[PDB]
Amino acid sequence: SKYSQDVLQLLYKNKPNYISGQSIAESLNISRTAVKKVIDQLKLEGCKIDSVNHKGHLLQQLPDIWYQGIIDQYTKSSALFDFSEVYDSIDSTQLAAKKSLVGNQSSFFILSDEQTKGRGRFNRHWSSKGQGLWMSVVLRPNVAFSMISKFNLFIALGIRDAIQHFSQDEVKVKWPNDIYIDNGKVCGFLTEMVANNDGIEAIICGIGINLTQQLENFDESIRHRATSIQLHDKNKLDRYQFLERLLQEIEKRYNQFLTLPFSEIREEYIAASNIWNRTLLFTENDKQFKGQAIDLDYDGYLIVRDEAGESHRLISADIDF
Amino acid sequence: SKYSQDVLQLLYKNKPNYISGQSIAESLNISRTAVKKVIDQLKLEGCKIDSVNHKGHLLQQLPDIWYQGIIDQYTKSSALFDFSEVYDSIDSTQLAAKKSLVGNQSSFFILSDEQTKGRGRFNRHWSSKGQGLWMSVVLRPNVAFSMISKFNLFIALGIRDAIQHFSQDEVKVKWPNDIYIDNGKVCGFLTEMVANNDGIEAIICGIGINLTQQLENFDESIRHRATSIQLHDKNKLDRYQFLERLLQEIEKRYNQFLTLPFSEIREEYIAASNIWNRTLLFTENDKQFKGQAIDLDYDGYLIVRDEAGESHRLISADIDF
Numbered sequence: 001s002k003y004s005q006d007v008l009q010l011l012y013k014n015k016p017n018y019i020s021g022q023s024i025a026e027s028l029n030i031s032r033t034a035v036k037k038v039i040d041q042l043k044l045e046g047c048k049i050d051s052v053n054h055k056g057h058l059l060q061q062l063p064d065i066w067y068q069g070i071i072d073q074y075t076k077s078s079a080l081f082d083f084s085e086v087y088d089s090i091d092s093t094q095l096a097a098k099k100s101l102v103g104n105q106s107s108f109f110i111l112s113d114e115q116t117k118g119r120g121r122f123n124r125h126w127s128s129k130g131q132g133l134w135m136s137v138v139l140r141p142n143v144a145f146s147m148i149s150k151f152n153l154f155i156a157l158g159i160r161d162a163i164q165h166f167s168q169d170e171v172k173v174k175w176p177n178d179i180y181i182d183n184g185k186v187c188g189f190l191t192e193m194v195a196n197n198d199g200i201e202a203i204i205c206g207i208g209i210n211l212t213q214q215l216e217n218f219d220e221s222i223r224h225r226a227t228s229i230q231l232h233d234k235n236k237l238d239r240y241q242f243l244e245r246l247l248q249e250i251e252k253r254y255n256q257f258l259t260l261p262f263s264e265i266r267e268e269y270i271a272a273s274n275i276w277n278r279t280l281l282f283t284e285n286d287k288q289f290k291g292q293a294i295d296l297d298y299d300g301y302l303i304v305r306d307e308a309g310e311s312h313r314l315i316s317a318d319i320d321f
Numbered sequence: 322s323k324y325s326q327d328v329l330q331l332l333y334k335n336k337p338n339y340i341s342g343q344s345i346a347e348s349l350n351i352s353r354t355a356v357k358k359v360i361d362q363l364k365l366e367g368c369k370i371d372s373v374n375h376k377g378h379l380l381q382q383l384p385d386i387w388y389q390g391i392i393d394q395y396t397k398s399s400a401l402f403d404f405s406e407v408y409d410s411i412d413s414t415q416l417a418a419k420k421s422l423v424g425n426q427s428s429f430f431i432l433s434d435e436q437t438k439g440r441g442r443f444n445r446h447w448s449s450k451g452q453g454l455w456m457s458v459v460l461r462p463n464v465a466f467s468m469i470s471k472f473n474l475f476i477a478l479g480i481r482d483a484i485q486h487f488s489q490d491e492v493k494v495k496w497p498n499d500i501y502i503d504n505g506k507v508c509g510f511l512t513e514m515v516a517n518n519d520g521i522e523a524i525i526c527g528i529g530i531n532l533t534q535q536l537e538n539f540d541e542s543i544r545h546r547a548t549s550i551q552l553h554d555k556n557k558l559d560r561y562q563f564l565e566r567l568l569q570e571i572e573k574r575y576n577q578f579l580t581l582p583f584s585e586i587r588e589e590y591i592a593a594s595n596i597w598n599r600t601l602l603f604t605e606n607d608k609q610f611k612g613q614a615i616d617l618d619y620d621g622y623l624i625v626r627d628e629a630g631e632s633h634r635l636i637s638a639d640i641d642f
């Protein structure tokens with residue numbers, strides 16, 4: 001409805017108090033009966049809303065659907081993000097972000113319940129409705145373009161922390177672009193930039209996180225190597241609580257990226273990684289080789305000793321277990 | 322008119338032969354009288370068209386206006402460019418290019434007679450109708466993002482050569498981003514990219530060239546340091562001939578960029594530069610200093626000895642004479 005988001009936003013703003021239908025009606029300049037109809041539709045879409053005669057309405061719980069009016073409250077109080085765009089379905093949050101950043105210096109993010117053309121690294125296929133967080137973040141660091149790599153390392157730890165807050169099981173980073181919970185890939189992200197020789201015009205970080213998929217919801221080919229946050233959380237995973245936590249952690253790590261050399265988080269990163277003490281398969285255009293991760297150095301390069309005993313120093317790699 | 326571009330394209334395709342009105346009418350499935358009206362309007366817009374009873378029409382000369390139908394013939398025979406977009410007016414060819422490249426791997430260029438929001442380096446103001454070439458080129462080199470700097474060096478020589486073909490006076494490059502004809506800035510360009518750690522998604526090269534401005538057409542504040550190609554060409558500068566030459570040279574230098582190390586053009590570059598043997602003013606965020614250009618090294622870095630005797634090695638700089 002035209003006013004569904006405004007009513008939802010009023011309900012969210014007023015937790016933990018009940019708000020009367022009349023207060024909503026006056027706030028939006030519509031009748032009591034249009035408020036009641038909007039609230040009925042919200043309950044029909046899966047809003048858990050307690051209604052009490054003479055007292056009004058209390059939003060208790062949101063469904064597994066993104067609502068622009070709620071996310072507006074997230075950006076309103078954000079020192080980092082100017083706005084968000086929220087979609088039920090699009091081709092890709094990353095395509096949208098790359099278009100929306102042109103011609104302005106706004107920091108913002110784009111969320112979609114579903115992507116019809118989700119793309120990962122190397123143009124690989126990735127995005128079902130209701131089961132995952134599909135998000136692109138656009139930021140404006142005043143730094144040289146060579147700093148993209150370090151951004152990628154900082155943001156990994158923020159994403160890992162946010163997921164770890166909801167998982168009873170250990171959450172690890174696979175350098176440089178994925179997150180795992182006990183052999184199951186729960187998240188992929190990729191950092192892209194627009195830049196020139198004078199500096200970066202935008203960072204676009206694309207983040208895809210499996211939230212509520214049950215094993216039955218993964219292809220039988222990938223079930224053993226894929227997982228969702230819900231499969232490691234004894235409690236219902238609430239996507240809004242999770243998003244709030246993810247944005248706090250993104251901001252924390254972005255400010256670290258702007259203020260700290262990577263050598264100051266390198267030990268934490270190494271201890272959060274699951275690439276050690278195992279044979280790794282590296283793909284590099286037309287050539288593939290096996291090797292071992294020896295170190296992650298002060299500049300974020302992975303130090304590798306390959307099967308033939310030769311050392312490599314890689315800013316990035318395409319790694320399989 | 323709906324068919325003005327199709328008729329213009331037929332006339333251009335048929336040089337050096339005359340084409341009859343009937344042949345155009347049959348080609349486009351319209352009447353002789355609509356062909357005659359279109360041709361009258363083309364002549365009114367400044368098309369020099371010879372019409373001869375019983376023989377037909379010969380396009381002899383185009384006005385100082387960009388026509389999509391002509392540029393289509395330029396991209397049709399190009400091994401490099403898939404298409405172009407041609408505008409009478411837009412905010413910026415570079416904004417448009419950055420939007421049009423999202424979600425595809427096409428190579429293309431964007432031309433506008435006028436820009437209302439032309440922007441150079443550091444968001445500086447730059448774009449009058451009828452007097453200049455305002456163009457953005459989008460290319461798809463399969464290379465690492467650190468290669469942007471070398472692209473910038475190769476393209477400089479192509480732009481310089483194209484201008485030099487029409488100027489009786491020596492044309493020089495001011496590293497890293499401008500072209501001069503005897504103390505007059507005739508061109509600015511800037512190379513930008515979209516990239517991630519796995520490689521470049523697009524090069525966007527924005528090129529602005531003063532073509533036909535007379536000194537009266539420059540602000541009185543910049544007249545002594547600004548120039549146009551026309552002011553150094555005893556012959557009428559024809560913008561289409563010039564564009565054709567500029568695109569040949571862009572392609573030549575792009576293929577060099579893809580195949581040669583910079584050390585193979587470094588000597589030519591040094592001999593084409595006008596930054597030697599003079600005091601230069603460098604601006605670097607909040608600090609400014611004076612210095613001398615000592616060398617351009619094998620990697621494209623400018624070697625500078627500053628006024629205090631300290632050496633600097635700069636991938637890029639903000640330089641004034």
Ligand SMILES: Cc1ccc2oc(=O)n(CCCCn3nnc(CCCCC[C@@H]4SC[C@@H]5NC(=O)N[C@@H]54)c3F)c2c1
Pocket residue numbers: 092093094095115117118119120121122124125126134135136177178185186187188189190206207208209210222225226227
């Ligand atoms: C979690 C999970 C588990 C098992 C999987 O078996 C799969 O086949 N897949 C999909 C492909 C994952 C490979 N990949 N490529 N690039 C990356 C890193 C970048 C991924 C793109 C992230 C976001 S999604 C929102 C935004 N809008 C886009 O179009 N991209 C970005 C990968 F992990 C499996 C996946």
Ligand SMILES: Cc1ccc2oc(=O)n(CCCCn3nnc(CCCCC[C@@H]4SC[C@@H]5NC(=O)N[C@@H]54)c3F)c2c1
Pocket residue numbers: 413414415416436438439440441442443445446447455456457498499506507508509510511527528529530531543546547548
């Ligand atoms: C020729 C000429 C002579 C005298 C001048 O006195 C001036 O004030 N100006 C304008 C500013 C020139 C400084 N500049 N900044 N970045 C650069 C390099 C990048 C310039 C942008 C080029 C293209 S134009 C098509 C495309 N679409 C855009 O928005 N940008 C690009 C500069 F030379 C004078 C200029």
